[PDB]
Swiss-Prot record, chain A:
Designated gene of the protein: PRE7
This protein's name: Proteasome subunit beta type-6
Signal peptide: none
Domain of life, source organism: Eukaryota
Subunit organization: The 26S proteasome consists of a 20S proteasome core and two 19S regulatory subunits. The 20S proteasome core is composed of 28 subunits that are arranged in four stacked rings, resulting in a barrel-shaped structure. The two end rings are each formed by seven alpha subunits, and the two central rings are each formed by seven beta subunits. The catalytic chamber with the active sites is on the inside of the barrel.
Interval of the full protein contained in this chain: 20 to 130 of 241
Function field: Non-catalytic component of the proteasome which degrades poly-ubiquitinated proteins in the cytoplasm and in the nucleus. It is essential for the regulated turnover of proteins and for the removal of misfolded proteins. The proteasome is a multicatalytic proteinase complex that is characterized by its ability to cleave peptides with Arg, Phe, Tyr, Leu, and Glu adjacent to the leaving group at neutral or slightly basic pH. It has an ATP-dependent proteolytic activity.
Disulfide partners: none
Family designation: Belongs to the peptidase T1B family.
From Swiss-Prot, chain B:
Protein name from the UniProt record: Proteasome subunit alpha type-3
SUPFAM superfamilies to which the protein is assigned, alphabetical: N-terminal nucleophile aminohydrolases (Ntn hydrolases)
Subunit-level organization: The 26S proteasome consists of a 20S proteasome core and two 19S regulatory subunits. The 20S proteasome core is composed of 28 subunits that are arranged in four stacked rings, resulting in a barrel-shaped structure. The two end rings are each formed by seven alpha subunits, and the two central rings are each formed by seven beta subunits. The catalytic chamber with the active sites is on the inside of the barrel.
Matches recorded under Pfam families: Proteasome, Proteasome_A_N
Entry annotated with the keyword Cytoplasm: yes
Record cross-link Glycyl lysine isopeptide (Lys-Gly) (interchain with G-Cter in ubiquitin), residues: 99, 198, 230
Origin organism lineage: Eukaryota, Fungi, Dikarya, Ascomycota, Saccharomycotina
Signal peptide residue numbers: none
Keywords from the named record: Cytoplasm, Isopeptide bond, Nucleus, Proteasome, Ubl conjugation
Entry similarity comment: Belongs to the peptidase T1A family.
Swiss-Prot record, chain D:
One biological process term in Gene Ontology: proteasome-mediated ubiquitin-dependent protein catabolic process
Protein name: Probable proteasome subunit alpha type-7
Post-translational modification: The alpha and beta forms are probably products of the same gene with different post-translational modifications.
UniProt entry keywords in alphabetical sequence: Acetylation, Cytoplasm, Nucleus, Proteasome
Cell compartment(s), UniProt: Cytoplasm; Nucleus
Role summary: The proteasome degrades poly-ubiquitinated proteins in the cytoplasm and in the nucleus. It is essential for the regulated turnover of proteins and for the removal of misfolded proteins. The proteasome is a multicatalytic proteinase complex that is characterized by its ability to cleave peptides with Arg, Phe, Tyr, Leu, and Glu adjacent to the leaving group at neutral or slightly basic pH. It has an ATP-dependent proteolytic activity.
Curated annotation (Swiss-Prot), chain E:
GO cellular component labels: mitochondrion; nuclear outer membrane-endoplasmic reticulum membrane network; nucleus; proteasome complex; proteasome core complex, alpha-subunit complex; proteasome storage granule
Annotated signal peptide: none
Organism listed in the record: Saccharomyces cerevisiae (strain ATCC 204508 / S288c) (Baker's yeast)
Keyword list, A-Z: Cytoplasm, Nucleus, Phosphoprotein, Proteasome
Residues recorded with modification Phosphothreonine: 58
Name of this chain's protein: Proteasome subunit alpha type-4
Length: 111, 244, 195, 243, 240, 241, 235, 231, 250
């Protein structure tokens, strides 16, 4: 039977300071015991000083980042180029994720 | 597009009348007269057939009087084809109620739903209304014997005695004159026939130009019977009251 | 698990229903009324799948109340039971069926007679002198077969019912936290507060 | 009367006046032509230079369907584009099911049936274009012209627009003077001449020439635009003949 | 589906189908609502060109929507059944989801919304009906009387009338109804309602219907003799 | 008078749109003819190519519907091709559903029923065409069945259609009065084609070259159209007698 | 007849232009924007004295930071308000923030042209939408059935609009206090109203950053009416 | 006359009057100008107010980072068409990782406008658009008309008195086309162009709207004190 | 391309007439005469075969049609409208009766279904009424022999004998003089041929007349044997030769 999920490995880490924040992630991409790539980035600048990563199943991770980047673009179009605050981005990402509640994105997301 | 050819069947006139409903009522006023009379121990339905030929098969014919269930019948005035569409709907509606509640449908409930269907054709859908007026005669254990009428507007009202179709104005005056509340079925039979005999556009009222029916509790022990009269039985009842 | 009983006597129908609501290893509530008044002289008790029970009961209640307002008339207990049966008989071949069993106790004002109907989730209707749903019947039916008479008073019916609850409290595995008892007669529906 | 107010209504003659009114919109448009040759077809069109501000070479009017069919039209330009978009869908589904690229007669009937369908109902307007089209298939070269009614035939030469009569007369001379056939490179030059001659019926604004061709030998059976040296050579041939 | 825009604007900014629906209301039998200190009374005309009627079974002019709210109307009778049915269904639906009966304002707002929807929907004509909706909110003793009309506007009234010759009975109520002091009792309120109908009704034996609504679902319809006593009493005081 | 624009009855019980569709039939100014032999059914039609720029091989009003059925149309080409594509589809579907080749008369009935719908339903106009179907049916033998915009259809011993149809009709009537039989008593289809052209020449009073005619022939298990040279061969045979 | 979405020869939609005539028949509504807030005021216009005027609801809350006044066929506004409220709340659910006043207005105006042969005709009501957000501050918008909206410093709509607008042209400046704006709406309403202005036949409201959208009591408006009459007599 | 009831009806001379009436709404609209060099493309638009108390109706809309338009006519129709363009540009990016060619943008608008001119019930769009962009073949300017006709140009203008600017640009063609690598000068030429369409009114700070896209410039709009430089 | 005619094309006029039904009846009046006569042991239906051309084969055009083995139909008015009604009538006899009850419908109920179809063409969106009147003759076990007329409105009436179309007024009068309740089937065929000669002008033989009966069961016409309960159709179309035999003793 066809299994729609996979595990591409890797790990990510986010820390917040007083006037800054970091989002780190390793660049290795794997399936089972093989290396697919030694440099495949999974931490992205999404605009409006928001960085994002969706780690787990890479297809679902890329899809989610792609949809959120697009969500930022349309937020500008619909609300007079207003800056998307981090709290508003977070709430928007919840709805992206929960919209697939019964066929989930297998990712741990950090912004 | 097709806007050009639309009659707009469901609009108001400047005076606040529904054109198509008014014109359907005008159609109905040329149809054969049908009379309903409610007595204390039963109901009479009497109706005049609309032009006969000597070669029309009279015994195997049904034009005016239709059975809806064992306890309810209707007299028709208007387009027969339109009436049969509505009758089959009413027959189904009665059986739905029986299936749901295990009780025969109350007369008013059946009348209201048939009248609601007619109303719909005057408010939406762009179709012509049904060119039909009904007299409903029936019995249930809440109100006993009941007469109603409905018309193309989908408005219905209850009656002690009523006429539809041709010469209703003259017929209603005659019923209003000779009707009284303590009346029996056999007296009502006589009133129904006498009224048609005076309001008819024919030369003389005969058995072959009539349909007749009674709803009595004539069967024993509170059980209600519908009698759709045969040709020979109409011939006999016409002799018995001295019209022929 | 959920106990619903019914007894039809000379002049009334008596419904007894258990007060416990249990989820897992916790009794969440001990005062639950497993009943809805459908009309002034018709009462429905219910038991079955969580959520489904109350959702179905209230849906039937709304429909009977809608009928009452429309016709300015109360449906007979026989008519209400047939409506309820048909709704369950539809439900059983749906995508997700209502898993609810009901008893309908009513007083027919036209006949001046009490009436008790037992209807399961499949839509299996029977009129009975006494009825029960679930495991309760395995004790109460034989007990009532012995002690029931058709001409009993409401007081005799309540004592007969006390006998059933005592037997269930002795031999049933689960604590059902007693019963709420309600009487349906010519004067309508009332609750016995001290049982 | 009122027979001309609604599409699909027959007049007492047996005519659909709305289609005849769409033909008037075609007659108002610029001139376009088609020339069938030895192993292919050539298409040309007049582009009126309304202003200095129009970018030369950059408002392309001839359109390709699949890889082997070319289409040009006169009249309402948007209506022509709608027809080509449909033609592309029809050619794509034919290739999907049957593998082989759509034959030209097959393609002609696909457009024909679609245009004819817009004369069957009062809820649609007929097409305001006559379309000249064709290409090369397994059976050789085919040229077609399709009209607002849905009517189409095969042609040796075809013309439509404001200068159709001038162009038709010039086309009839080529058919008479070349019974054996015309070559592809010759037909490109002749197409330029005929557009320049047909421009006499639209001579207020000066114009820009646009040519395309399909030929079994010259373009390998595919639709290509004529550009650069071959275009300027064809323009010069046409300029020499008007003087 | 039949799509035609039947209700549309005209050059002067009127929607004629909505305005012609108001003419149907003007043709209908007169209906009046008067609210007292502790009650609302709904009075209704019944035309007397119809003798040989059966009043047991004939549709009554005032309809119960729930046990605490009533609806009367003027205009097309068949149209009114559709509004009453929808209102009755919404009444039960509100009880089911909010666990509380409708307020009179809410039930009115719903009925008015239905009427408005039929003025900008394709394929439909407006309702040829105006309604008076009266009752008491749950656990409240303040009387409520609202009016709706075909356009979809609704509002609250101390007293109001609709139907044929309503302008005559509105004139009467405008001078005979004091806002400081509404009718203190049912008796005073019913009498003022009967008086106002007596300006137009032509008599009032079988022509007048009265329905009294009091707080906590207390609705009763008066009989002929009960109404006839008000008619008899008013005429004797008039001869002065 | 909107009763003349759509297919509803006029006060005298007429459908004017149907009547005006009949007038569209003659818009091409072409006459057709059909006759039956012992073994075959021949249909002939005039071919007028006015424009010199036209490719004459693409100008045709005869259509091969199925292997066994042929159809000639009298009326404008867009409506003709509309009818032809539908008939081809219907004949193909019949074979798939019912396991045998659609008979000529059944296809005629089906196309006539479709035409009837356009006379009753308002949104669809009638097609301004008359369709003549020809075959050698495996049960009924040589067959001619003809459909019009009213949705009428019938079988024929022989038939003709077009502006000068009545002249051709009476010419054929007079022949069958004389011969006393239902068909052309001839063995080969070649001589039945010669009969068809000869009697068209006599009725119309015109001579024909090879490019002025169009011929379709139905035999057992195939319907085919003739080339210009097949017709020329046929014209030579008439001239030498 | 003719299509509902037909253009006139001058390049205007018949039905939209005819709905604008319906709005001219409607009761007056005025809005004034300041740096201390936005004031919204309306003429109630009871058709009869028996009608309980406090049930006339022509000023309406959309969210805490956005209010709305109407003029024309006011029944048509119910579904527009319903849409506005849903749009405002939905945006708060999706983005955990208040929705910009301009974005709300644009959402309401998207409904406007969704008519034809969608609803059967345009809306017969104009809206004044007033609000505050952090980006553009205090704002007033005029939303028409054409689907167009303009921001305004001040605006009047309804039967007295052209006279009231000319008065607003003179009186408005960029330094108006909230109290000054309140009196100015009352003054201009009293000028264009048929009946004599009081607390029962006119209604005031405002939106401020601090307290949000508030409809004023009849007691509060009555004092502002009294303060206005005294100030006009005082020179 | 009898043939202007809907878009589905041709006149006896082959005209579509509903489409021509839609065209008339553009002529009543406020003037807007478009022009380009080889490196940049510029839109200039005169904005219109209701009165002195109102805002000035925004004429310019951004479609992508590399594309956008100016409008003249029904503004809600420009919103529908710009939103369609935003989606088509977006589809091209998400699916093909490809910036939508300005020529394809034109073709898509043509076909969307056309469908509204051949079916019963619908109406034509009542707005004209000037689309500018920078793509893989350099700078572009397009003119959209709601008949469906789209046209690529060096420069143009639409709206009331657009003929003044259109004549000016026709004279200035050889100058402004070679303003390469100089944004401010290409805007100055566009501002001088729109000045040939002014009557009784002059260009103020809250009246003028300028947009620019080019080689190393995303599509950006200038309003308010950012256009004071050019008056 | 969509159907925009969702509204009625038959509406009431101020006088109460339904125009399109009246005009449909006018079309029926123009149509060729057809008749039906009911005997004690059968029913006969008959009509003239109006040939459009002498080159046309009038055998291929059937005006009298079998609906069920015991029910037949004939018409006056528009032929194409009749043809599609026969298709729909044959199908509805199966879908709404035979596929449910395993037997063919009685005459009155099949008639009722045809009437319904014709009524819907009088009220539904975007359609004109059918331009035909039908005469339907048939037999069934519990009602015996019967004859019905169906009009464009959807109304139907049972008849002892009647005629419709061109010369119906004269033909009805002729049938009144000759009809009695003791007529045998052969006597009814004789009267049918006499009545039809009055309205026919040209040739009067078995090739220009179409005539069918509803009578005794025909086991020979069944096509199989073995089941005693299967009987064979009561409907039979008289041959060209069978008509000419009766025209000699006329």
């Amino acid at each position: 039977q066809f299994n729609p999920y996979g595990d591409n490995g890797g790990t990510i880490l986010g820390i917040a300071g007083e006037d800054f924040a970091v989002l780190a992630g390793d660049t290795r991409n794997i399936t089972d015991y093989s290396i697919n790539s030694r440099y495949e980035p999974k931490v992205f600048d999404c605009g409006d000083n928001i960085v994002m990563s969706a780690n787990g199943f890479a297809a679902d991770g890329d899809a989610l980042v792609k949809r959120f980047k697009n969500s930022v673009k349309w937020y500008h179009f619909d609300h007079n180029d207003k800056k998307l605050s981090i709290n508003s981005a977070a709430r928007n990402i919840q709805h992206l994720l929960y919209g697939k509640r019964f066929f989930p994105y297998y990712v741990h997301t950090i912004i | 597009g097709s806007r050009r050819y639309d009659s707009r069947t469901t609009i108001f006139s400047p005076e606040g009348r529904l054109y198509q409903v008014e014109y359907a009522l005008e159609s109905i006023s040329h149809a054969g007269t049908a009379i309903g009379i409610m007595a204390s121990d039963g109901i009479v339905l009497a109706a005049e057939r609309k032009v006969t030929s000597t070669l029309l098969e009279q015994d195997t014919s049904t034009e005016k009087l239709y059975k809806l269930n064992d306890k309810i019948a209707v007299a028709v005035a208007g387009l027969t084809a339109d009436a049969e569409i509505l009758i089959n709907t009413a027959r189904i509606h009665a059986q739905n109620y029986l299936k749901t509640y295990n009780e025969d449908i109350p007369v008013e409930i059946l009348v209201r739903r048939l009248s609601d269907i007619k109303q719909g054709y005057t408010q939406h859908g762009g179709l012509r209304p049904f060119g039909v007026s009904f007299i409903y005669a029936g019995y249930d254990d809440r109100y006993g014997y009941q007469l109603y009428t409905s018309n193309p507007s989908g408005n219905y009202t209850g009656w002690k005695a009523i006429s539809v179709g041709a010469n209703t104005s003259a017929a209603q005056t005659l019923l209003q004159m000779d009707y009284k509340d303590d009346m029996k079925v056999d007296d009502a039979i006589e009133l129904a026939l006498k009224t048609l005999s005076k309001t008819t556009d024919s030369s003389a009222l005969t058995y072959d130009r009539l349909e007749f029916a009674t709803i009595r509790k004539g069967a024993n022990d509170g059980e209600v019977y519908q009698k759709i009269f045969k040709p020979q039985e109409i011939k006999d009842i016409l002799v018995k009251t001295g019209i022929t | 698990m959920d106990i619903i009983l019914g007894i039809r006597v000379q002049d009334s129908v008596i419904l007894a229903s258990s007060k416990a609501v249990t989820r897992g290893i916790s009794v969440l509530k001990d005062s639950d009324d497993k009943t809805r008044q459908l009309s002034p002289h018709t009462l429905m008790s219910f038991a079955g799948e969580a959520g489904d029970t109350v959702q179905f009961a209230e849906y039937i209640q709304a429909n009977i109340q809608l009928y009452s307002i429309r016709e300015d008339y109360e449906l007979s207990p026989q008519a209400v039971s047939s409506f309820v049966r048909q709704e369950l008989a539809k439900s059983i071949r749906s995508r997700r069926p209502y898993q609810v069993n009901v008893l309908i106790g009513g007083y027919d004002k036209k006949k001046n007679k009490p009436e008790l109907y037992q209807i399961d989730y499949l839509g299996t209707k029977v009129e009975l002198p006494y009825g029960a749903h679930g495991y309760s019947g395995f004790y109460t039916f034989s007990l009532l077969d012995h002690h029931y008479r058709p001409d009993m008073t409401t007081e005799e019916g309540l004592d007969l019912l006390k006998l059933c609850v005592q037997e269930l409290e002795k031999r049933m595995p689960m604590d059902f936290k007693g019963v709420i008892v309600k009487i349906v007669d010519k004067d309508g529906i009332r609750q016995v507060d001290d049982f | 009367t009122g027979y001309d107010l609604s599409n699909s209504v027959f007049s007492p003659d047996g005519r659909n006046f709305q289609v005849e009114y769409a033909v008037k919109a075609v007659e108002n448009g610029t001139t376009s032509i088609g020339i069938k040759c030895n192993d292919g077809v050539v298409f040309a069109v007049e582009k009126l230079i309304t202003s200095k501000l129009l970018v030369p070479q950059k408002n392309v009017k001839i359109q390709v369907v699949d890889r082997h069919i070319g289409c040009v039209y006169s009249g309402l330009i948007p209506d022509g584009r709608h027809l080509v978009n449909r033609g592309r869908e029809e050619a794509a589904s034919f290739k999907k099911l049957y593998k082989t690229p759509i034959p030209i007669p097959a393609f002609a009937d696909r457009l024909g049936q679609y245009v004819q369908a817009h004369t069957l109902y009062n809820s649609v307007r007929p097409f305001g274009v006559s379309t000249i089209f064709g290409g090369v298939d397994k059976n050789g070269a085919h040229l077609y012209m399709l009209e607002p009614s849905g009517s189409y035939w095969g042609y040796k030469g075809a013309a439509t627009g404001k200068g159709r009569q001038s162009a038709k007369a010039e086309l009839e001379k080529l058919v008479d003077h070349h019974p054996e056939g015309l070559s592809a490179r010759e037909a490109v030059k002749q197409a330029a001449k005929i557009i320049y001659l047909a421009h006499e019926d639209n001579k207020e604004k000066d114009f820009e020439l646009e040519i395309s061709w399909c030929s079994l030998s010259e373009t390998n059976g595919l639709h290509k635009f004529v550009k650069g040296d071959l275009l300027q050579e064809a323009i010069d041939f046409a300029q020499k003949e008007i003087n | 589906g039949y799509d035609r825009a039947l209700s549309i604007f005209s050059p002067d900014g009127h929607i004629f189908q909505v305005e012609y629906a108001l003419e149907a209301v003007k043709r209908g039998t007169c209906a009046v609502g008067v609210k007292g200190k502790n009650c609302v009374v709904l009075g209704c005309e019944r035309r007397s060109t119809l003798k040989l009627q059966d009043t047991r079974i004939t549709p009554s002019k005032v309809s119960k929507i729930d046990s605490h709210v009533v609806l009367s109307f003027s205009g097309l009778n068949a149209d009114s059944r559709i509004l009453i049915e929808k209102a009755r269904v919404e009444a039960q639906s509100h009880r089911l989801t909010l666990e509380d009966p409708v307020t009179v304002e809410y039930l009115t707002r719903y009925v008015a919304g239905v009427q408005q929807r039929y003025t900008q929907s394709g394929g439909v004509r407006p309702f040829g009906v105006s309604t008076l909706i009266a009752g008491f909110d749950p656990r409240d003793d303040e009387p409520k009387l609202y009016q709706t009309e075909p356009s979809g506007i609704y509002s609250s009234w101390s007293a109001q009338t609709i139907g044929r010759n309503s302008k005559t009975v509105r004139e009467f109520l405008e001078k005979n109804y004091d806002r400081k002091e509404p009718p203190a009792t049912v008796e005073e309120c019913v009498k003022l309602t009967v008086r106002s109908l007596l300006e137009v009704v032509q008599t009032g034996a079988k022509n007048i219907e009265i329905t009294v609504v009091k707080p906590d679902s207390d609705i009763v319809a008066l009989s002929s003799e009960e109404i006839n006593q008000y008619v008899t009493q008013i005429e004797q005081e008039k001869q002065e | 008078g909107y009763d003349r624009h759509i297919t509803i009855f006029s006060p005298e019980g007429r459908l004017y749109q149907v009547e005006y569709a009949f007038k569209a039939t003659n818009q091409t100014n072409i006459n057709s003819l059909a006759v039956r032999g012992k073994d075959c059914t021949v249909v002939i039609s005039q071919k007028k190519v006015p424009d010199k720029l036209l490719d004459p091989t693409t100008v045709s009003y005869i259509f091969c519907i199925s292997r066994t059925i042929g159809m000639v149309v009298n009326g404008p080409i867009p409506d003709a091709r509309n009818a032809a594509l539908r008939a081809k589809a219907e004949a193909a579907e019949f074979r798939y559903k019912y396991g045998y080749d659609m008979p000529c008369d059944v296809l005629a009935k089906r196309m006539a029923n479709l035409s009837q719908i356009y006379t009753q339903r308002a949104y669809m106009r009638p097609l301004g065409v008359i369709l003549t179907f020809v075959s050698v049916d495996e049960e009924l033998g040589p067959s001619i069945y003809k459909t019009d915009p009213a949705g009428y259809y019938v079988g024929y011993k022989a038939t003709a259609t077009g502006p000068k149809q009545q002249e051709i009709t009476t010419n054929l009537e007079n022949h069958f009065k004389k011969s006393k039989i239902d068909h052309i008593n001839e063995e080969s289809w070649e001589k039945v084609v010669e009969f068809a052209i000869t009697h068209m020449i006599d009725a119309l009073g015109t001579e024909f070259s090879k490019n002025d005619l169009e011929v379709g022939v139905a035999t057992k298990d195939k319907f085919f159209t003739l080339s210009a040279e097949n017709i020329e061969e046929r014209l030579v045979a008439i001239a030498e007698q | 007849d003719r299509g509902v979405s037909t253009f006139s020869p001058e390049g205007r939609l018949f039905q939209v232009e005819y709905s604008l005539e319906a709005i001219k028949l409607g009761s007056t509504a005025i809005g004034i924007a300041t740096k201390e807030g936005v004031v919204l005021g309306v003429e109630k216009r009871a058709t009869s004295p028996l009608l309980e005027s406090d049930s006339i609801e022509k000023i309406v809350e959309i969210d805490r930071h956005i209010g709305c006044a109407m003029s024309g066929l006011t029944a048509d506004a119910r579904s527009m308000i319903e849409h506005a409220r849903t749009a405002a709340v939905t945006h708060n659910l999706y983005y955990d923030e208040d929705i910009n006043v301009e974005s709300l207005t644009q959402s309401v105006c998207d409904l406007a042209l969704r008519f034809g042969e969608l609803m059967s005709r345009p809306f017969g009501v104009a809206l004044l939408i007033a609000g505050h957000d952090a980006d553009d501050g205090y704002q007033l918008f005029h939303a028409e059935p054409s689907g167009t909206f303009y921001r305004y410093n001040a605006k009047a709509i309804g039967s007295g609009s052209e006279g009231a607008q000319a008065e607003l042209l003179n009186e408005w400046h960029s330094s108006l206090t909230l109290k000054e704006a309140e009196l100015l709406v009352l003054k201009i309403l009293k000028q264009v109203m048929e009946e004599k202005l009081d607390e029962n036949n006119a209604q005031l409201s405002c939106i401020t950053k601090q307290d949000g959208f508030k409809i004023y009591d009849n007691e509060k408006t009555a004092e502002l009416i009294k303060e206005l009459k005294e100030k006009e007599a005082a020179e | 006359n009898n043939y202007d009831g809907d878009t589905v009806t041709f006149s006896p001379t082959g005209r579509l009057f509903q489409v021509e009436y839609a065209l008339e709404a553009i002529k009543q609209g406020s003037v807007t100008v478009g022009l380009r060099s080889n490196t940049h493309a510029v839109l200039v638009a005169l904005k219109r107010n209701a009165d002195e108390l109102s805002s000035y109706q925004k004429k310019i809309i951004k479609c992508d980072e590399h594309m956008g338009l100016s409008l003249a006519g029904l503004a809600p129709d420009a919103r529908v068409l710009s939103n369609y363009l935003r989606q088509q540009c977006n589809y091209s990016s998400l699916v093909f990782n490809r910036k939508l060619a300005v020529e394809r943008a034109g073709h898509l608008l043509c076909d969307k406008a056309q469908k509204n001119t051949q079916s019963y019930g619908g109406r034509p769009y009542g707005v004209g658009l000037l689309i500018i962009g920078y793509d893989k073949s350099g700078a572009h300017l397009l003119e959209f008309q709601p008949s469906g006709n789209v046209t690529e140009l060096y420069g143009t203008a639409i709206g009331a008195r657009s003929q003044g600017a259109k004549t000016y640009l026709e004279r200035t063609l050889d100058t402004f086309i070679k303003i390469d690598g100089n944004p401010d000068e290409l805007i100055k030429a566009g501002v001088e162009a729109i000045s040939q369409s002014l009557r009784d009114e002059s260009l103020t700070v809250d009246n003028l709207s300028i947009a620019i896209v080019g080689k190393d410039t995303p599509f950006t709009i200038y309003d308010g004190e950012a256009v004071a430089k050019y008056i | 391309m969509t159907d925009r005619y969702s509204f009625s094309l038959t509406t009431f006029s101020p006088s109460g007439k339904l125009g399109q039904i009246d005009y449909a009846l006018t079309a029926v009046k123009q149509g060729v005469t057809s008749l039906g006569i009911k005997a004690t042991n059968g029913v006969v239906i008959a009509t003239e075969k109006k040939s459009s051309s002498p080159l046309a084969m009038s055998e291929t055009l059937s005006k009298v049609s079998l609906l069920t083995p015991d029910i037949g139909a004939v018409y006056s008015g528009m032929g194409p409208d009749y043809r599609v009604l026969v298709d729909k009538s044959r199908k509805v006899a199966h879908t709404s009766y035979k596929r449910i009850y395993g037997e063919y419908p009685p005459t009155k109920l099949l008639v009722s279904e045809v009437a319904k179809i014709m009524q819907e063409a009088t009220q539904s969106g975007g359609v004109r009424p059918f331009g035909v009147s039908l005469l339907i003759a048939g037999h069934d076990e519990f009602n015996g022999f019967s004859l019905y007329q169906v009009d464009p409105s959807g109304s139907y009436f049972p008849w002892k004998a009647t005629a419709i179309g061109k010369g119906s007024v004269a033909a009805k009068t002729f049938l009144e003089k000759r009809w009695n309740d003791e007529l045998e089937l052969e006597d009814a065929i004789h009267i049918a041929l006499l009545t039809l000669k009055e309205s026919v002008e040209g040739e009067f033989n078995g090739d220009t007349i179409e005539l069918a009966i509803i009578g005794d069961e025909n086991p020979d016409l069944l096509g199989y044997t073995g089941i005693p309960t299967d009987k064979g159709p009561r409907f039979r179309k008289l041959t060209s030769q069978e008509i000419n035999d009766r025209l000699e003793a006329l």
